[PDB]
Design a protein around this nucleic acid. Structure first.
Ligand SMILES: [K+]
Ligand SMILES: [K+]
Ligand SMILES: [K+]
Ligand SMILES: [K+]
Ligand SMILES: [K+]
Ligand SMILES: [K+]
Ligand SMILES: [K+]
Ligand SMILES: [K+]
Ligand SMILES: [K+]
Ligand SMILES: [K+]
Ligand SMILES: [K+]
Ligand SMILES: [K+]
Ligand SMILES: [K+]
Ligand SMILES: [K+]
Ligand SMILES: [K+]
Ligand SMILES: [K+]
Ligand SMILES: [K+]
Ligand SMILES: [K+]
Ligand SMILES: [K+]
Ligand SMILES: [K+]
Ligand SMILES: [K+]
Ligand SMILES: [K+]
Ligand SMILES: [K+]
Ligand SMILES: [K+]
Ligand SMILES: [K+]
Ligand SMILES: [K+]
Ligand SMILES: [K+]
Ligand SMILES: [K+]
Ligand SMILES: [K+]
Ligand SMILES: [K+]
Ligand SMILES: [K+]
Ligand SMILES: [K+]
Ligand SMILES: [K+]
Ligand SMILES: [K+]
Ligand SMILES: [K+]
Ligand SMILES: [K+]
Ligand SMILES: [K+]
Ligand SMILES: [K+]
Ligand SMILES: [K+]
Ligand SMILES: [K+]
Ligand SMILES: [K+]
Ligand SMILES: [K+]
Ligand SMILES: [K+]
Ligand SMILES: [K+]
Ligand SMILES: [K+]
Ligand SMILES: [K+]
Ligand SMILES: [K+]
Ligand SMILES: [K+]
Ligand SMILES: [K+]
Ligand SMILES: [K+]
Ligand SMILES: [K+]
Ligand SMILES: [K+]
Ligand SMILES: [K+]
Ligand SMILES: [K+]
Ligand SMILES: [K+]
Ligand SMILES: [K+]
Ligand SMILES: [K+]
Ligand SMILES: [K+]
Ligand SMILES: [Mg+2]
Ligand SMILES: [Mg+2]
Ligand SMILES: [Mg+2]
Ligand SMILES: [Mg+2]
Ligand SMILES: [Mg+2]
Ligand SMILES: [Mg+2]
Ligand SMILES: [Mg+2]
Lengths: 194, 82, 97, 99, 212
RNA sequence: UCCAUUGCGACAACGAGCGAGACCCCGGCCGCGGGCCGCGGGACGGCCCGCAGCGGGAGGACGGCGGGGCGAUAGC
RNA sequence: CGAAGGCCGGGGGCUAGAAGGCGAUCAGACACCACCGUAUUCCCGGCCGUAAACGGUGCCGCCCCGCGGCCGGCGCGCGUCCCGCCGGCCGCCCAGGGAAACCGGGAGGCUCCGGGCUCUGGGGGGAGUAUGGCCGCAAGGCUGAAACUUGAAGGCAUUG
């Protein structure tokens, strides 16, 4: 309920006036001016499911976190800071999963992107070397080569920061690192871009 | 089981994996197939070790993007959602 | 000679025949949905003399009359006078004005 | 001359990041700190260094960088007092939870 | 000696990985050719040069001549491979082509025409393939039948290990690289097709996987 | 943008090399040494103005150093 | 039934304008450009039956990832909008197809080939010609060979 209040302050529940057929299951109503609204319960269930997918991997440094959007850059360096995932902040360089001579080349087991139209090169390249992917998806998202969507508002900084903060909290809960049923010492403000 | 001899010996070189969503054989050279696994907590919000649940999805279903629906359906019916 | 454009070089959708317009430069006969068309609005005196006319008028509150003329050319004249340019194969798909 | 080759520029970067302290915005002094197998080559690389210094003034700009992106202020930035969910999120929260 | 540059090639180095059927079960690419040579030591793999073509690049000061070559490999008992290479000199062209032919190895499914008495001796079922304007059909045959093919196709079917077989070809099969590509794709499709022998469902155990 | 595939910056490409430049020779101004010859210094788009760099001024022997040598791949 | 041109018999005659005439240009210019001009262009009653008559794509019927735009009719909604349904016209496009260009409302569901029906083609020339027939006032149209000759012709695409 407290996290619901936080989701309401960040407005993580508002879409972008267009709807795809595969996101139709996550919609609840439509605002008059055309904006769509997500069912927040479904959003939380996708967050929990993604957390339960992340913890199967023994070493977290082989999870890739890719986010080209400036408004998310800060938020992705903190998700790693408490989970020990591997961040690819800026322009994704072609070849990073397919070309072994590259200096930042790697062979991860999960790709976690922020947006499916930004960061398209990572999503397309991961389909050549057997990586599944999880994406933060808005109402107009195209789910090609994506296995788990997360319905959410992926433009405003508060939304993005709170989303990565929730994900990292539930992962640290599931692994046993931080205690269950108790507010994390980390304020979500550390994830939002100033 | 695989193809068999006249006596009972399975004379099949190897057994390809089937898609968990479409029942299709995976086959080698298909570098768009993804096999991934899930926690199965069973203990008050913490996972336990070496007890997972695994599924397969071929490039044919990924290419158009039916996993976000099919894998949710599968996990609901294996007791991972509702 | 394969096909160069999906629209075959004109905008004719669901009909058999469209009207004829003469080209203004050379007076060639061109079908209306193929002719290159533009609309111009311009004063009848140059702006380098519109100030002198406006000072030397007598009518208090007088304004400069405008002009509204639709120019229509054929493809040859349009390319020759540079109303339209030959473009790259990629660029040909752009409809931005 | 006018344009400097990438040999010169590649040099100038490592040189200035290695002697940020020693370099002033003049040329005579910067020569010493560059003092390369030729003296005209020396002259050109030092010419670019003398510009990089008065361009970086307007490391010492990276130590505070890691101290700035960590400070979490005493407030919370979401300490909201009043709900504004009166429209479609109203029925959304009715059909999820308490209200 | 040789040094891995990929994680799978590192797992090759230890006694970790045993055979190709697991690497094909979990269908990963194979990026180094000594990965192959670890499993296939010292001339279990046969290696044949089908063709050297000379290709020309027209230029302001005359033409520019290079070499393309195509090469086949196979262990006579269930693996086939086809590669090509382009270079300034014939030796290097062939060397590239052979290396690519060995990173392009696939298994092949074989079965029983008619009676299932002995070992699989012909294609498991009909196979079809296509490359360019060429299309190929491989049809199962009874024992003693042989390899009814053209000299180009028969050589690939010999390296793969398919004793008896009827073949059919349509399109411009004088285009040799497309002919060999069609036959290659036909042999590669052998392990994609559901047959009642494999219908049955199973439990996936994350332990067994080789962690991509 | 520059004399210049010279560079800035952007990009299914990432990372190197040659040619260019650098280099050699001569000639301007100044020092130590020898008795002019032979060893070094000096000049850099450095200074101050206006908008990777195009402009205007200043000082200096010389202002964007000047005349030459060498010279990619492919060839007729 | 059938664009335009053309033909027969009546009418009309502004514009433009095959033919014809004339000024330039030019080596020549009987052409392009300038000027004058007859049929024709318009109407009434007929005839002729062809066009890159083109989406170079026959007609009926089924299935088909998606995102838009416009046009006609209908219905539910809130307070003109908004969501749908049927029919039409269009753009972009996953898969699949293909020699490719591209198609994709098919040019898909096809060497894994079989829903129904009608028409046409079989290397390049000679030739749509000769000959016979039917139609037409004519101009034509429709039907349409043989001897003989030839190693290519041609499609889409790459570098110069
Ligand atoms: K792919
Ligand atoms: K053509
Ligand atoms: K046209
Ligand atoms: K229309
Ligand atoms: K129309
Ligand atoms: K019309
Ligand atoms: K126009
Ligand atoms: K024209
Ligand atoms: K580029
Ligand atoms: K480019
Ligand atoms: K490209
Ligand atoms: K001396
Ligand atoms: K001397
Ligand atoms: K008629
Ligand atoms: K008619
Ligand atoms: K007519
Ligand atoms: K007439
Ligand atoms: K008249
Ligand atoms: K006429
Ligand atoms: K003439
Ligand atoms: K002429
Ligand atoms: K006249
Ligand atoms: K006439
Ligand atoms: K008349
Ligand atoms: K006429
Ligand atoms: K008339
Ligand atoms: K007629
Ligand atoms: K016709
Ligand atoms: K025709
Ligand atoms: K047409
Ligand atoms: K028909
Ligand atoms: K309408
Ligand atoms: K309408
Ligand atoms: K209508
Ligand atoms: K309407
Ligand atoms: K309507
Ligand atoms: K409508
Ligand atoms: K409809
Ligand atoms: K319809
Ligand atoms: K209609
Ligand atoms: K359309
Ligand atoms: K239509
Ligand atoms: K029928
Ligand atoms: K017909
Ligand atoms: K026909
Ligand atoms: K026909
Ligand atoms: K015909
Ligand atoms: K026929
Ligand atoms: K005759
Ligand atoms: K007659
Ligand atoms: K007549
Ligand atoms: K006659
Ligand atoms: K006649
Ligand atoms: K041709
Ligand atoms: K032709
Ligand atoms: K032709
Ligand atoms: K082509
Ligand atoms: K061709
Ligand atoms: Mg007249
Ligand atoms: Mg007249
Ligand atoms: Mg007429
Ligand atoms: Mg026609
Ligand atoms: Mg329309
Ligand atoms: Mg006759
Ligand atoms: Mg071609």
């Amino acid at each position: 309920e407290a996290d619901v209040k936080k989701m309401l302050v960040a407005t993580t529940h508002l879409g972008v006036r267009n709807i795809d057929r595969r996101m139709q299951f996550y919609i609840f109503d439509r605002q008059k001016d055309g904006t769509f609204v997500f069912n927040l319960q479904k959003v939380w269930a996708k967050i929990v499911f993604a957390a339960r997918i992340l913890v199967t991997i023994d070493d977290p440094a082989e999870i890739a976190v890719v986010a080209n959007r400036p408004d998310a850059q800060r938020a992705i360096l903190k998700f790693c800071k408490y989970t020990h995932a591997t961040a690819f902040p800026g322009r994704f360089i072609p070849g990073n999963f397919t070309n072994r001579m590259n200096p930042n080349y790697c062979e991860p087991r999960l790709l976690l992107v922020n947006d499916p139209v930004v960061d398209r090169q990572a999503i397309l390249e991961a389909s050549y070397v057997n990586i599944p992917t999880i994406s933060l998806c808005n109402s107009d998202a195209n789910l090609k080569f994506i296995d788990v969507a997360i319905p959410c508002n992926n433009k405003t900084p508060m939304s993005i920061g709170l989303i990565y903060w929730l994900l990292a909290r539930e992962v640290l809960r599931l692994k046993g690192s931080i205690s269950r049923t108790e507010e994390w010492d980390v304020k979500p403000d550390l994830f939002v871009a100033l | 089981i695989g193809m068999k001899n006249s006596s009972g010996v399975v004379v099949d070189a190897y057994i390809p994996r089937k898609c968990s969503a479409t029942n299709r054989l995976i086959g080698p050279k298909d570098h768009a197939a993804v096999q991934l696994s899930v926690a199965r907590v069973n203990d008050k919000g913490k996972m336990i070790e070496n007890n997972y649940v695994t599924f397969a999805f071929c490039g044919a279903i990924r290419s158009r993007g039916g996993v976000d629906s099919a894998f949710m359906l599968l996990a609901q019916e294996h007791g991972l959602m509702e | 000679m394969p096909v160069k454009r999906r629209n075959n070089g004109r905008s004719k959708y669901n009909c058999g025949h469209t009207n004829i317009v003469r080209c203004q430069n050379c007076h060639r006969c061109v079908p209306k949905d193929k002719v290159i068309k533009r609309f111009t609005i311009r004063n009848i005196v140059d702006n380098t003399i519109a100030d002198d006319v406006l000072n030397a008028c007598v009518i208090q509150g007088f304004a400069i009359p405008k002009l509204y003329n639709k120019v229509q050319y054929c493809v040859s004249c349009s390319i020759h006078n540079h109303i339209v340019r030959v473009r790259s194969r990629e660029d040909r798909k752009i409809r931005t004005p | 001359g006018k344009v400097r080759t990438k040999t010169i520029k590649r040099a100038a970067r490592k040189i200035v990041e290695n002697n940020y302290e020693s370099l002033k915005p003049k040329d005579f002094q910067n020569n010493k700190a560059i003092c390369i197998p030729s003296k005209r080559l020396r002259n050109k690389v030092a010419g670019y260094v003398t510009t990089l210094m008065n361009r970086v003034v307007k490391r010492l700009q990276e130590e505070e960088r890691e101290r700035r992106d960590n400070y979490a202020p005493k407030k919370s930035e979401f300490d909201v007092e009043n709900i504004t969910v009166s429209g479609a999120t109203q029925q959304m929260i009715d059909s999820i939870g308490f209200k | 000696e040789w040094h891995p540059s990929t994680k799978l090639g590192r797992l090759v180095k230890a006694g970790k990985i045993e055979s190709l059927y697991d690497i094909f079960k979990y269908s990963l690419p194979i990026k180094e050719t000594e990965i192959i040579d670890y499993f296939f030591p010292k001339s279990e793999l046969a290696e044949e040069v089908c063709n050297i073509m000379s290709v020309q690049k027209q230029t302001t000061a005359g033409q520019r001549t290079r070499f393309r070559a195509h090469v086949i490999v196979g262990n006579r008992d269930g693996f086939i491979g086809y590669g090509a290479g382009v270079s300034k000199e014939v030796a290097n062209a062939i060397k590239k082509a052979a290396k690519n032919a060995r990173l392009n190895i696939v298994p092949v499914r074989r079965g029983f025409w008619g009676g299932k008495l002995g070992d699989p001796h012909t294609v498991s079922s009909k196979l079809s393939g296509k490359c360019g304007s060429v299309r190929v059909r491989l049809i199962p045959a009874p024992r003693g039948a042989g390899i009814v093919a053209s000299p180009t196709v028969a050589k690939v079917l010999e390296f793969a290990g398919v004793s008896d077989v009827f073949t059919r070809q349509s399109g411009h099969s004088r285009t040799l690289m497309n002919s060999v590509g069609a036959v290659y794709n036909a042999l590669k499709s052998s392990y994609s097709i559901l047959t009642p022998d494999l219908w049955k469902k199973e439990q996936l155990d994350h332990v067994q996987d080789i962690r991509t």
